[PDB]
Design a binder for this molecule. Structure first.
Ligand SMILES: CCCCCCCCCCCCCCCCCC(=O)OC[C@H](COP(=O)([O-])OCC(O)COP(=O)([O-])OC[C@@H](COC(=O)CCCCCCCCCCCCCCCCC)OC(=O)CCCCCCCCCCCCCCCCC)OC(=O)CCCCCCCCCCCCCCCCC
Ligand SMILES: CCCCCCCCCCCCCCCCCC(=O)OC[C@H](COP(=O)([O-])OCC(O)COP(=O)([O-])OC[C@@H](COC(=O)CCCCCCCCCCCCCCCCC)OC(=O)CCCCCCCCCCCCCCCCC)OC(=O)CCCCCCCCCCCCCCCCC
Ligand SMILES: CC(C)=CCC/C(C)=C/CC/C(C)=C/CC/C(C)=C\CC/C(C)=C\CC/C(C)=C/CC/C(C)=C\CC/C(C)=C/CC/C(C)=C/CC/C(C)=C\COP(=O)(O)O[C@@H]1O[C@H](CO)[C@@H](O)[C@@H]1O
Ligand SMILES: CC(C)(COP(=O)(O)O)[C@@H](O)C(=O)NCCC(=O)NCCS
Ligand SMILES: CC[C@@H](CO)NCCN[C@@H](CC)CO
Lengths: 132, 31, 90, 450, 445
């Protein structure tokens, strides 16, 4: 196969939300992260990761669904698929990997009715759900 | 009538209340 | 009146505590900045530790006019011979 | 005060240009830390989120008391988030540490440390070698090192002038640099090391004004970071997030301290050729200097107090490095300034005018070659993208067949045999040892920097 | 003290856990009769134990009388008894006459010897013999330096060459020779006018030339070379720069290899060594003990610890070769600190808080011994607790309290002035019982 290629800054713009692992942050300063507000998070479209031996044992275990993480949502909501990527002029080098997120069912965001309440610095509604 | 007698009070007052006000910040209503 | 060889012997034990210069270098013809490299930020400490042992307040009005050890011994001599109120009670 | 910029500041040497211009270009072409993307993503979302959350882990729980420094990067990211702009407080801090280390700490150790050029070269080169591989990213180690240096400088100024105001600002500085990260406990070591000459001031000035006018400001100064730590958060949410982080995240109880040194002796990317200098060039200069200050008590150019307080601070830092919830190697960047200040004292202590016998200087040369051999026994890899194009990025260096650590080990063995031969025959006036043992630490540090 | 040590060392011969290498050496001894040579049974393609097999040759002759473990471990108890008798009657009366007459120094020496010997040397390993060779070379070098003669220094080299051939870690027996080489040369040069320098250095090389008879008594050179090559290209070895891996193996959580007893045995040795060195540097001497042999006793331990970098294997059980030096160092340390802590109230607090921190670090491990020696041991799977609190934190808070007390005592020599404490029958009673109390507690445990 003689592939036809395209840049990442051009394919992935600077508007779509992207799930970047905690290692790839300074190499991609133009992509927009997956913001969150009021306890609800956005839905990402791509996932950027480091190379194989780093992603396998440092970032896939740190951001795990069972210890908070961020890969607990995208395994329940989306499906990931690898894409073919090459580092220009330095073939044979492992730069990382890019992935594509496909929805399982077609759904649109909610509306989240709001309100306010004044606590007293010692109030606690109860513990969080951590482990079984 | 000497300013050392005034500084001696300005150092104890506003140095004790500035310390009892800092331990109450973690305990104060928030919205 | 305090002898010169005890004034110098009392100043050397402070110079050796502040900076670390051996008391065999403190002679009455040594400058405080050229021969003995003692910046004035150490002269302030010497003038503080002087008062903290023998009550003597050397004001910064006069702490600049001391360029040699002879100047120090002359200053101490003149101030102790002028004022007869030298307690010298430990 | 009769002026600012005292007359011992206004001096220029050849070490200042080297350090400044070797840091201002490592800021451009040099490597970065590992937790740079982690902090960048934490800071780029903290304004939409509203509470400076931990983005990647722990169910969206914030930085519990340790978050006042990231709120500055959250403000910086409004201009731009380029790698060359978001990393300025790591160059400003480096310049400040060099200024302080060169014009406040070295002249304080006596007229023999501030009169030798080899000591200045050693201090500069060790500062560079300890700053390069650790404090060029976004991890807040350079800031904590600068805070712990400012605290020491202020306490020494209080001891010198005989006042309590610098000793009062030092408490606020230590509190604020502790409020950055849990590893900021290295700053109260500077307060413990200087407690005796501050009690000597309090108990002396309290017989003129009293006790409370001197104690209450010292309490208001210490208890003021609570108004910055608990500005947005609350004690209940802090307790909840701490419960989460303790029940889930790496806890690393205090008796697991040896992991930090077990990770250093492995031939991996975490512990590499460049990531061992910051610790070896500190221990190798700290221990023999301690054993030499124990026996000798008059070195004719060194002040005893300021020289003992530095070793006390270094040992208290090595002690306080326990009790931290995480045992990483990145926590070795805290020694950037104290190792540079200890190398300048070791260079004077092991000089041919202080160590007068040839066999002791030969043994120290052997030890230097041994620690060099230990340094060069790993790979030359950097973390994520600084590793692109490195010479020996995934293998132990070799000059052809034989490694480079083996050559240094052979040289060290030869030096040890020479020292033993000088020991047997009771010789103290060798002449080529005088040539070989003049400032070995500056050379061994410049080698690693180059 | 001799009765107590020998009793506690004879009742440990029966109710005592064996080591990890007691089934290995026993099988090697049982199968080496046939096969023509001392084969490595479980590894290395049938390679031989070529340089290090003079002890298996003796174990192969003992194993032909009875294979009972109470009879095969008999050469490892005579070594312990001889080591203790030497430490008690040749070493302590040599350092000083007043250090051996002290009734607390001897007790703490015995307790420290027991506490450093029991967790390590109760098997078919060569460490019980290396620990005896070290302390029998030290006394011979001391007998040669004083009472000027050369044949003791010639028998010491033969004993050291026998020790080097036991195991790679057995080269630490050369340390008491390297440390005393200068005094032995001073003794040699006093004969240049009478006899010469050849008639005094030829018999000293004839002693070093015994390893070539010990090693190559059954095999050739090209066979030992092939054995070493196989063991280096096959087996697990670690380089010289990963030497801290030993001290990491000693202090690791959830391991029956670093226990709360081995940790104590090693940390007390390190404390005693680095306290004696600091007292000898700070103060010019230790009054009551001769400072001549004391410097050599400290240098022997230092050089022995430094020589352990060249060994190929760096397990944590190899620290059992210092059980002869630990017993002689604990007594002299408790004697030297008895005066340093009697005329100053803060040195005593520093000593006590150092002991308490050592206890806190040691007690954070399990109390396991091995495969079978764990049946019934109380804390063999969890770290010790009293009722529900971890006992590794009580000691830490007590050590921090002691450190604060020492700091407070340091902050008062400017106001209360230098105060003479006392010298009575009680003020000398609490200044020397530390390191005896905790050692007795560990031995009883
Ligand atoms: C085990 C150790 C645990 C504690 C036991 C011993 C620690 C205390 C020091 C031992 C004494 C050494 C000595 O005699 O020198 C005398 C020295 C001589 O004074 P001088 O000649 O008159 O002149 C003094 C100056 O004029 C005036 O100077 P100054 O009077 O102002 O001195 C103040 C200076 C104090 O001056 C000092 O320099 C203190 C001593 C610094 C060095 C301490 C020596 C320790 C060396 C051990 C040797 C190991 C070497 C290994 C070699 C090869 C290894 C590869 O600063 C301090 O006071 C702060 C003290 C903080 C030291 C904390 C030590 C922590 C332990 C080490 C941590 C390591 C943990 C690693 C984790 C393990 C992972 C594997 O001054 C002192 O006596 C210092 C006394 C300090 C009292 C302690 C106050 C706080 C309590 C500390 C306990 C910590 C809590 C636990
Ligand atoms: C490849 C090797 C790599 C080199 C390793 C790098 C290390 C080099 C520097 C190491 C320094 C040596 C340490 C010696 C400390 C023990 C000395 C002592 O305490 O005094 C008693 C004793 C002398 O007592 P003395 O003269 O009767 O009386 C004392 C005076 O009255 C008054 O006392 P003084 O002033 O006369 O004594 C002061 C003495 C005392 O002052 C002190 O500072 C003592 C305290 C410092 C030592 C601190 C202890 C270190 C403990 C290490 C512990 C490590 C693990 C601990 C870890 C904890 C957690 C990680 O300090 C010194 O002696 C320093 C100069 C010694 C030069 C003599 C020849 C140097 C040979 C280098 C040794 C290589 C070691 C074997 C390497 C394998 O010490 C000795 O002189 C023995 C030295 C003779 C040893 C010969 C070693 C064989 C040389 C052949 C080497 C070739 C091997 C290469 C391998 C081949 C493969 C290819
Ligand atoms: C020359 C001349 C004129 C004189 C020379 C003699 C002198 C003066 C000095 C000699 C110094 C020497 C020769 C030191 C040699 C030791 C060193 C520094 C390295 C060893 C060199 C070799 C040959 C290593 C071979 C590799 C090997 C055999 C590894 C096997 C490990 C062994 C045998 C023991 C390790 O110890 P262990 O594994 O903890 O336990 C034992 O092994 C079994 C259990 O597995 C059990 O049988 C034992 O308990
Ligand atoms: C201490 C002293 C009176 C004497 O110093 P000098 O004689 O060298 O000018 C003078 O230098 C001074 O007042 N310095 C205060 C300025 C200072 O310490 N730092 C300036 C900002 S860091
Ligand atoms: C396994 C990754 C580790 C560093 O190696 N992450 C460290 C966590 N970083 C902290 C911020 C610097 C979190 O608040």
């Amino acid at each position: 196969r003689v592939p036809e290629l395209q840049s990442v800054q051009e394919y992935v713009g600077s508007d779509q939300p992207v799930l970047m692992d905690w290692a790839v942050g300074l190499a991609f300063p133009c992509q927009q992260p997956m913001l969150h507000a009021n306890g609800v998070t956005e839905v990402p479209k791509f996932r950027i990761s480091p190379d194989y031996y780093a992603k396998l044992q440092s970032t896939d275990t740190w951001q795990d669904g069972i210890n908070g993480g961020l890969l607990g949502i995208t395994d329940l909501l989306l499906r990931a698929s690898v894409m073919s990527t090459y580092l220009s002029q330095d073939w044979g080098q492992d730069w990382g990997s890019l992935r594509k997120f496909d929805t399982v069912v077609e759904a649109t965001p909610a509306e989240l009715d709001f309100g306010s309440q004044t606590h007293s610095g010692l109030y606690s509604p109860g513990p969080l759900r951590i482990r079984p | 009538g000497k300013d050392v007698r005034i500084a001696r009070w300005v150092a104890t007052i506003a140095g004790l209340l500035g310390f009892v006000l800092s331990v109450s910040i973690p305990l104060l209503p928030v919205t | 009146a305090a002898t010169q060889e005890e004034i110098i012997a009392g100043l050397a034990e402070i110079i050796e505590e502040v900076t670390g210069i051996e008391p065999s270098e403190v002679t009455p013809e040594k400058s405080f900045v050229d021969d003995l490299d003692i910046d004035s930020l150490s002269m302030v400490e010497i003038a503080v530790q002087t008062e903290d042992k023998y009550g003597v307040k050397i004001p910064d009005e006069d702490l600049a006019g001391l360029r040699t050890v002879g100047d120090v011994v002359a200053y101490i001599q003149k101030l102790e011979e002028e004022n007869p109120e030298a307690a010298a009670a430990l | 005060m009769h002026r600012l910029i005292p007359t011992r500041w206004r001096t220029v040497t050849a070490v200042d240009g080297v350090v400044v211009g070797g840091m201002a270009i490592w800021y451009v072409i040099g490597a970065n830390s590992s937790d740079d993307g982690y902090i960048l993503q934490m800071a780029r979302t903290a304004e939409h989120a509203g509470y400076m959350a931990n983005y990647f882990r722990w169910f969206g729980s914030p930085e519990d008391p340790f978050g006042w420094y990231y709120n500055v990067l959250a403000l910086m990211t409004k201009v731009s988030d380029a790698s060359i702009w978001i990393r300025l407080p790591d160059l400003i801090c480096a310049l400040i540490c060099w200024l302080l280390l060169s014009r406040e700490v070295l002249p304080r150790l006596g007229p023999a440390v501030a009169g030798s050029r080899a000591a200045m070269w050693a201090a500069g080169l060790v500062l560079l070698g300890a700053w390069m591989p650790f404090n060029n990213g976004l991890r807040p180690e350079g800031q904590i090192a600068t805070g712990a240096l400012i605290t020491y400088v202020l306490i020494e100024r209080a001891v010198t002038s005989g006042r309590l105001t610098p000793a009062a600002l030092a408490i606020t500085t230590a509190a604020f640099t502790l409020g950055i990260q849990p590893t900021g406990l290295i700053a109260v070591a500077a307060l413990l090391a200087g407690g005796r000459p501050i009690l000597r001031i309090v108990m002396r000035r309290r017989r003129l004004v009293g006790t409370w006018p001197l104690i209450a400001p010292l309490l208001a100064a210490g208890t003021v970071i609570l108004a910055v730590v608990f500005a947005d958060q609350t004690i209940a949410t802090v307790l909840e997030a701490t419960r989460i982080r303790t029940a889930i995240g790496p806890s690393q109880e205090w008796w697991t301290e040896n992991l930090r040194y077990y990770y250093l002796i492995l031939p991996t990317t975490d512990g590499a050729i460049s990531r061992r200098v910051a610790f070896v060039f500190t221990a190798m200069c700290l221990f023999p200097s301690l054993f030499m200050m124990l026996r000798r008590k008059h070195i004719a150019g060194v002040a005893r107090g300021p020289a003992w307080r530095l070793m006390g601070i270094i040992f208290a830092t090595m002690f306080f490095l326990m009790f931290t919830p995480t045992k990483w190697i990145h926590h070795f960047g805290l020694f950037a300034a104290v190792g540079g200040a200890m190398a300048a004292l070791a260079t004077v202590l092991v000089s041919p005018t202080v160590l007068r016998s040839a066999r002791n200087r030969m043994a120290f040369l052997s030890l230097v070659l041994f620690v060099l051999a230990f340094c060069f026994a790993s790979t030359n890899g950097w973390w994520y993208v600084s590793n692109f194009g490195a010479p020996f990025n995934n293998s132990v260096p070799k000059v052809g067949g034989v490694q480079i650590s083996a050559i240094f080990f052979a040289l060290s063995a030869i030096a040890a045999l020479w020292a033993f031969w000088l020991h047997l025959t009771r010789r103290t006036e060798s002449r080529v040892v005088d040539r070989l043992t003049a400032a070995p630490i500056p050379v061994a540090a410049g080698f690693m920097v180059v | 003290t001799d009765t107590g040590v020998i009793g506690g060392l004879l009742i440990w011969h029966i109710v005592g856990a064996p080591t990890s290498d007691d089934g290995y050496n026993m099988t090697i001894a049982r199968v080496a009769s046939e096969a023509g040579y001392t084969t490595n049974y479980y590894r290395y393609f049938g390679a031989s134990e070529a340089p290090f097999d003079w002890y298996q040759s003796v174990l192969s002759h003992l194993a032909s009388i009875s294979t009972a473990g109470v009879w095969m471990r008999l050469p490892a108890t005579a070594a312990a008894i001889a080591t203790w008798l030497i430490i008690s009657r040749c070493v302590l009366p040599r350092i000083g006459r007043r250090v051996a007459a002290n009734r607390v120094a001897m007790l703490t020496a015995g307790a420290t010897f027991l506490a450093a010997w029991l967790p390590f040397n109760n098997g078919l390993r060569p460490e019980p013999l290396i620990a005896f060779a070290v302390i029998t070379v030290w006394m011979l070098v001391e007998n040669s330096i004083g009472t000027r003669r050369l044949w003791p220094a010639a028998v010491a080299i033969v004993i050291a060459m026998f020790s080097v051939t036991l195991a790679p870690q057995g080269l630490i027996a050369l340390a008491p020779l390297l440390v005393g080489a200068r005094a032995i040369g001073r003794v040699v040069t006093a004969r240049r006018a009478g006899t010469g320098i050849l008639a005094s250095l030829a018999p000293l090389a004839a002693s070093v030339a015994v390893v070539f008879v010990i090693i190559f008594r059954d095999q050739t050179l090209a066979t030992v070379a092939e054995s070493v090559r196989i063991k280096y290209v096959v087996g697990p070895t670690i380089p010289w720069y990963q030497e801290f891996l030993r001290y990491y193996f000693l202090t690791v959580e959830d391991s029956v290899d670093g226990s709360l007893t081995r940790r104590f045995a090693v940390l007390v040795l390190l404390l005693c060594l680095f306290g004696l060195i600091m007292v000898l540097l700070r103060r010019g001497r230790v009054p009551g003990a001769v400072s001549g042999p004391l410097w050599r006793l400290c240098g022997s331990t230092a050089i022995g610890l430094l020589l352990l970098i060249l060994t190929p294997t760096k397990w944590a059980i190899q620290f059992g070769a210092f059980a002869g030096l630990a017993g002689a160092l604990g007594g002299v340390t408790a004697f030297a600190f008895a005066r340093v802590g009697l005329h100053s109230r803060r040195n005593l607090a520093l000593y006590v808080t150092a002991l308490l921190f050592i206890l806190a670090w040691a007690t954070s491990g399990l109390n396991g011994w091995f495969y079978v020696g764990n049946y019934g041991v109380p804390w063999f799977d969890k770290q010790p607790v009293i009722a529900h609190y971890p006992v590794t934190t009580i000691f830490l808070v007590l050590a921090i309290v002691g450190g604060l007390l020492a700091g407070w005592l340091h902050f008062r020599m400017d106001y209360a002035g230098h105060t003479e404490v006392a010298d009575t029958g009680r003020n000398r009673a609490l200044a020397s019982t530390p390191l005896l109390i905790v050692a007795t507690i560990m031995v009883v445990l």
